[PDB]
Structure formats: C-alpha cells, structure tokens
Amino acid sequence: ESTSNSKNVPPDLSICTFVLEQSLSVRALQEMLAN
Amino acid sequence: RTQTGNNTTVNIIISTVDYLLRVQESISDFYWYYSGKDVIDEQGQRNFSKAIQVAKQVFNTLTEYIQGPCTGNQQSLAHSRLWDAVVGFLHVFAHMQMKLSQDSSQIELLKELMDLQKDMVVMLLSMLEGNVVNGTIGKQMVDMLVESSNNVEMILKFFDMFLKLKDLTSSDTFKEYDPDGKGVISKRDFHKAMESHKHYTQSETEFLLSCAETDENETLDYEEFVKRFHEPAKDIGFNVA
C-alpha cells in the first residue's frame, strides 16, 4: 500500500497496522517449539 | 576518559563498558545453552569459571574507574550501555542461583557467580557515590531496576529464603529436634521443623529440601547447610539493601 501520495490519495493503514505480540530469543523460541 | 592535550581522544571507559556488554552477552548465550540440560558438564563449568573471572576483573576495573567521586566517569557510565549489561547479568544471576542451588556438585560455580554478583553491586553502589537528590544516575538506575523487576524480585526472594534459615536454626523447635550437639538431622525432622515454624510455605519448603543433598542414612548437616547458603546471602543482601 502506497503512502507517498497521501496528499491526493489517502492510504489505508487499517490493513497495514501490525501488533508485536511476542519477542523471544532464537534459543527460547526453539525450546518452546520443541516443548 | 579524555586526553586534554592530544589531537585525538579515545574513551577507554566506553571501550571497557562495550567489552563488558559483549562478555555478558556471551555468558547469557552460554547459560541459554545450558538451561535445558539437567547437569552442567565439567568443560562447561571451566568455561563458566573463566568467563566469570573475566567479568569480575572487568567489574573491578569499572569500579576503580568511578571510585573517588570521578563525576566525568560516572556520567560517562550513566550515558553508556552499562545498564543493558546489568540487566542481562541480573537475569543470569536470578536464574542460575535457583538452577545451581538444587545441585550439590555446582558449589564452586555458585560461589564464583555469587561473588560476581557482589562485585556487580559494589560497582552499582560506587555509581551512586556523591549522589544528589533527583539525580540523573538515580533515575537511570531506577529505570534499570524497573526493566529488570522480575529478576530483582527473584533474587530478593532467594535471599529472604536463605536469611531466615539462620533464625530457624537458632529456634527452639530445631534445637529440640536436635537435642544433642552432633548437629546432624534427617529430612523428616528438618521438614517437620520447617512446617512447625510456619514461616516457610510448601514451595519454599520443597525448594529448601531439594537444595539439601540426601546422604546414605538420610541425615543432612544443617550447620554447613546454613553457613554455605547464609554467608554469601548475608553479604550480597546487605549491599542490595
């Protein structure tokens, strides 16, 4: 979705927003995936 | 920190802080490798010992940098990346203390680690030498503690467990559970004492029993138990307080 021409065409950020739920290290991710 | 007359200046203080951060990252990675495993190999123990010795020396160098209220060095550490290293070290300390205490072969590693913790707290106390009311260093240390809230709470609960053990030992119920001067008691008698004390819950009771090694006749040596787990606690907890 383009956001450069906002002055003329409003962008749709409602489908661009993302929420960062989890932030784990690589080793911890591997461990919980194994578990 | 600064060379007044030279054309070019290098911040040895910041370089030392950066190396400390790299060392703490390496130690955290090695702990994350050994966390799942039930026991730590001899080679792993040697690597931990060497890394802890290196970190201890770096911490001593850092505290010698800032003792004698060197305000410039104190501000440099405050604005450096020392706080991230302290946060990582707090997590490592809060988890390794529980992990190693249960095992009875990790005594020397636990001692090395909980001496590194004391050198840590000495450095942090030296950072607050010459502090002012509402100081920037105080604000940045409170932020660090808030970031590491859980690990500090775990360390505090560990220390509070192992500081009440001396009072429980000196209590009358324990002295009548050991009417003689031999000083050796079974896990029956020790668990019954810890429940008749009513200070320790079931989680603390089970953890304390686990941290005491069972021998052939199922009798533990409470004086060495309390000494080993009380003296380092009595040392570090005072600096934390």
Q: Alpha-carbon torsion B124, B125, B128, B129, what sign?
A: negative
Using alpha carbons, list the distances in angstroms from residue A1 to A8, A19, B90: 14, 18, 43
Residue where the block lists tokens 């960062």:
A20
- Cβ atoms of residues B27 and B116 within 8 Å: no
Q: Which H or E element spans position B235?
A: helix B222-240
Tell me, yes or no, if A24 comes closer than 8 A to chain B by beta carbon.
no
Please give the Cα distance from B142 to B136 (Å, whole number).
Answer: 10
Helices (H) and strands (E) in chain A, counts: 1, 0
Does B36 sit within 8 Å of A31, measured CB to CB?
A: yes
Those of residues 91-150 in B touching chain A at CB distance below 8 A are none
Q: Pick from B25, B133, B167, B62: which is nearest to A27 by CA? A: B25
Please give the Cα distance from B114 to B117 (Å, whole number).
Answer: 5
What tokens does B137 get? 């260093």
Q: Pick from B77, B94, B58, B60: which is nearest to B141 by CA? A: B77
Tell me, yes or no, if A29 comes closer than 8 A to chain B by beta carbon.
no
Tell me the CA end-to-end span of chain B in Å, nearest whole number: 31
